[PDB]
């Protein structure tokens, strides 16, 4: 929560043309069964991907 | 003030008016806070009521 | 004439001649820094 809010607080203020796409949260408290990170990360475009 | 007052005369509703204390419209910004953003100007007044 | 519309050689290129501004922190401020376009507008607006 504090990565992504500064990373909008900064990209807020930011006079440049910066874009993101989306932002994923990942489940890991459960198993990994239907594939939901796979679902969820496969719609991925953007060039660049903050982890 | 005219348009506010024709209105108050169509709807019964009285006004008591008064000018914005920062002297701008309105604008969303966070002067000491990097985690959270908040109003200032005449919407900001709207806001807090 | 100086300003043959919104976009002009004189407006597109801010010379140090020619200086145009407006209101900061307004709603124009707002429109003309939400566009990266305008970003090079925003430059010659923010210090006038």
């Given at each position: 929560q504090d990565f992504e809010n500064k990373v909008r607080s900064t990209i807020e203020?930011?006079?440049?043309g910066w874009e993101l796409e989306e932002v994923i949260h990942l489940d890991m408290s459960l198993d990994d069964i239907d594939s939901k990170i796979q679902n969820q990360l496969c719609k991925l475009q953007s060039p660049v991907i903050l982890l | 003030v005219d348009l506010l007052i024709k209105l108050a005369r169509e709807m019964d509703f009285t006004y008591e008016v008064h000018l914005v204390?920062?002297?701008?419209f309105g604008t969303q910004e966070r002067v000491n806070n990097s985690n959270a953003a908040a109003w200032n100007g005449m919407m900001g007044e709207l806001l807090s009521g | 004439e100086r300003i043959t519309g919104i976009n002009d050689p004189r407006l597109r290129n801010p010379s140090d001649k020619f200086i145009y501004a407006t209101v900061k922190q307004s709603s124009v401020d707002i429109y003309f820094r939400r566009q990266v376009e305008l970003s090079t507008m925003y430059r010659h607006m923010e210090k006038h």
């Open positions: 203020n930011s006079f440049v | 204390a920062d002297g701008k | -």
